[PDB]
Amino acid sequence: NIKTMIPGVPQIDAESYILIDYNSGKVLAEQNADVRRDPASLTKMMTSYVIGQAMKAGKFKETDLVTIGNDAWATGNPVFKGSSLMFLKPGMQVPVSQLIRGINLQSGNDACVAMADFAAGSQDAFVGLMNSYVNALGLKNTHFQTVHGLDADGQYSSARDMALIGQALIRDVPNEYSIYKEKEFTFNGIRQLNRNGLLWDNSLNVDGIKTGHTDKAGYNLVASATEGQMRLISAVMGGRTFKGREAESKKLLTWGFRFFETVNPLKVGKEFASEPVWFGDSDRASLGVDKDVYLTIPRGRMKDLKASYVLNSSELHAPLQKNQVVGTINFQLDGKTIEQRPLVVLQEIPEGNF
Numbered sequence: 517n518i519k520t521m522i523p524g525v526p527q528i529d530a531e532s533y534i535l536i537d538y539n540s541g542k543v544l545a546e547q548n549a550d551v552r553r554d555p556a557s558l559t560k561m562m563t564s565y566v567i568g569q570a571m572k573a574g575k576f577k578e579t580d581l582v583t584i585g586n587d588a589w590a591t592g593n594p595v596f597k598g599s600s601l602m603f604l605k606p607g608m609q610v611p612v613s614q615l616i617r618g619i620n621l622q623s624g625n626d627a628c629v630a631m632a633d634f635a636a637g638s639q640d641a642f643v644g645l646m647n648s649y650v651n652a653l654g655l656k657n658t659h660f661q662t663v664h665g666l667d668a669d670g671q672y673s674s675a676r677d678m679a680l681i682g683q684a685l686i687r688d689v690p691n692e693y694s695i696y697k698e699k700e701f702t703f704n705g706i707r708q709l710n711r712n713g714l715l716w717d718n719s720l721n722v723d724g725i726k727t728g729h730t731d732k733a734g735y736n737l738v739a740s741a742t743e744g745q746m747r748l749i750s751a752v753m754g755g756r757t758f759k760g761r762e763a764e765s766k767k768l769l770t771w772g773f774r775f776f777e778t779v780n781p782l783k784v785g786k787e788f789a790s791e792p793v794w795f796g797d798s799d800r801a802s803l804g805v806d807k808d809v810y811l812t813i814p815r816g817r818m819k820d821l822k823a824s825y826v827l828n829s830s831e832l833h834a835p836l837q838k839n840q841v842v843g844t845i846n847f848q849l850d851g852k853t854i855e856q857r858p859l860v861v862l863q864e865i866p867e868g869n870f
């Protein structure tokens with residue numbers, strides 16, 4: 517009863533949310549997680565991903581100077597009215613390091629344009645990259661039209677999709693993600709605070725990601741926090757009150773850490789099982805996984821976890837290719853399969869040569 521309890525989810529004062537484990541991908545809690553909503557400033561998480569991907573690929577460096585053009589002139593474009601801005605002016609020569617901090621820390625809309633032109637030649641081309649990454653990540657309820665998150669009529673995303681963009685940032689572009697925890701940066705003599713207030717919350721280790729508000733979106737937050745071996749991502753969209761701003765997301769994260777833990781029962785290349793092989797240069801196949809196994813389970817239940825396996829075929833016949841799928845690993849709690857992973861050949865077995 518204690519051992520098999522399903523914990524109640526706290527009431528969250530928002531249109532939609534999701535809570536996921538970063539490593540396992542497991543959804544711990546959700547409500548209206550696939551409803552299409554105005555992303556507001558959360559759009560900039562994708563802007564930052566594209567930039568992070570360009571930098572990973574070596575297209576430019578943080579020390580590189582970007583010359584500011586007219587479309588990134590903050591007080592030259594009334595579209596930027598009442599919005600977060602670096603106050604760039606044409607002709608300024610600003611290091612990439614400073615513009616990506618303008619975007620990540622400050623949500624500078626002008627810095628988004630500046631980087632979009634620098635990275636991709638035009639804002640349309642850059643939005644095209646954002647949308648190509650939407651497809652590659654397999655996001656089903658997301659579409660961008662703008663580089664900064666301006667309520668543009670046909671852009672949308674979802675709590676699920678925004679958490680997934682969060683996970684992609686941490687996983688694919690860790691050097692870009694490491695910027696999000698920085699509490700401040702200085703530009704043009706002026707000190708600028710990271711807008712993510714949760715970074716200052718002593719009770720959690722929040723290191724990301726992005727807050728947002730436009731008048732169609734409500735209050736929006738994608739947060740990520742760690743506690744030991746465990747990283748959670750929350751996405752809360754259409755938060756109703758100014759006071760629930762960080763509080764509602766904190767509720768989900770603290771609940772997640774209290775009731776769940778992440779286990780890593782198996783790593784790539786390590787033997788889980790061995791099976792006889794026929795016609796081979798060796799007599800036995802070493803079997804395991806081609807991707808690290810992470811599971812999210814109820815907290816405490818780690819020592820109750822059982823693993824077993826099944827095989828696709830009665831017999832293993834060489835040649836066996838490395839990472840050839842030959843079965844399925846079952847992870848179980850209380851005698852019930854909770855998670856499955858493909859069982860694969862770890863070391864190639866070509867046909868015998870004598």
Ligand SMILES: *C(=O)[C@H](NC(=O)c1c(-c2ccccc2Cl)noc1C)[C@@H]1N[C@@H](C(=O)O)C(C)(C)S1
Binds near residue numbers: 599600625667
């Ligand atoms: C993101 O949602 C908010 N940033 C804005 O700039 C903003 C816009 C906007 C206008 C032009 C281009 C893009 C955008 Cl998103 N329209 O309204 C706003 C407020 C930033 N997030 C909020 C917040 O979290 O409360 C601010 C710090 C006020 S600015």
